[PDB]
Amino acid sequence: IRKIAESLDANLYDVDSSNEGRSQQLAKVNKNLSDLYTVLKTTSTTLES
Amino acid sequence: VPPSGSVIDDYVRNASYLEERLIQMEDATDQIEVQKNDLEQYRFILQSGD
Amino acid sequence: VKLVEKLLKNNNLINILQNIEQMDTCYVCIRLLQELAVIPEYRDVIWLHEKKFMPTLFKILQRATDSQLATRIVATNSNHLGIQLQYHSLLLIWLLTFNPVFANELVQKYLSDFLDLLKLVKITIKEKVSRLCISIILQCCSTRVKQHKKVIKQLLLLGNALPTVQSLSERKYSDEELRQDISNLKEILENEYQELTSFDEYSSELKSGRLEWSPVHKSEKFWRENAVRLNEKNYELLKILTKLLEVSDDPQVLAVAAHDVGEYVRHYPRGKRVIEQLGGKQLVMNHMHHEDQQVRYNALLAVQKLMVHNWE
Secondary structure: OHHHHOOOOOOOOOOOOOOOOHHHHHHHHHHHHHHHHHHHHHHHHHHHO | OOOOOOOHHHHHHHHHHHHHHHHHHHOOOOOHHHHHHHHHHHHHHHHOOO | OOHHHHHHHOOHHHHHHHOOOOHHHHHHHHHHHHHHOOOOOOHHHHHOOHHHHHHHHHHHHHHHHHOOOOOOOOOOOOOOOOOHHHHHHHHHHHHOOOOHHHHHHHHHHHHHHHHHHHHHHHHOOOHHHHHHHHHHHHHHOOOOOOOOOHHHHHHHHHOOOHHHHHHHHOOOOOOHHHHHHHHHHHHHHHHHHHOOOOHHHHHHHHHHOOOOOOOOOOOHHHHOOOHHHHOOOOOOHHHHHHHHHHHOOOHHHHHHHHHOHHHHHHHOHHHHHHHHHHOOHHHHHHHOOOOOHHHHHHHHHHHHHHHHHHOO
């Protein structure tokens, strides 16, 4: 599967079949996006000003 | 019209300083998107597929 | 040698010299003073009376500092040849150039004006004037006397002349004397500049509890590889600084503390684990929500560079 699908796009992914890891799966990067939502505005504001 | 100050050089250095800082900062918040987007999409899988 | 004793302990002539609105008086008085100064063993005796006149010697130059005498917007600043008063003053200040120990101390009292003298090199169009400025400030340097290095240290601390150093370097004036002057100047001022195997002084600062924007604080020309110093105790040498950062919010130290953390992580991409031990990103964004936009800028720089090159 890997050496066939790499051609187009291989964004390797798989959930926890024990679908309670889902919780940390969400949170660990939900916090990251919450964080990254700022750099954009901060940088834009400083630069433009 | 008399001469203006030779702090032209001061402007040289400080303007350099500022523009290198600009070059650094501008292309910083740019590619944050490239890495965040893939998982922002994968949240879709996080929404279903069980 | 004896008449001078009475000619100096007197006070009426000095009262004559005390005036500021008259230039001929002080001009000629100190001009003949320097002419007689050809006897080097008289600057010595008059030294004890320094505080009486040396400030007078300095007031004219302090006025010259921002006063752009060359720009004739100053109506009748001096007679057409009057400005030569400054020339003579610096002539005298050079006449005291064969006893370093004399120059050794009085500096501690008026170092600031001596420092900001720096401008005269570029300001005055007259070759003589910039020449004497630079020559005097240099010749203060000497292997002859002690603590002949800290002076340039404070020079860099406050003035940051090196910009000016190379600036004047690019524009020599076809004067061999000046060529050697500036050549010495540059080398003597720059060779120590790399006197930074700063483990010792970083440790001293660590125990000092005080931080400040300084090339000793910031010089990557060594940090190309220095995490060895960070390796003393589980990289925790800076963790103390982090906890102090949390303790208070003093602008200089508060900013500098997290200023070089980004650099230090830049030195090891592997330091992501120590970084997550830090985990101060909330504190970092708070710093983007405090006064002094400059330190907010620095905190943003740190956090952004960090995250980016953890996932570059």
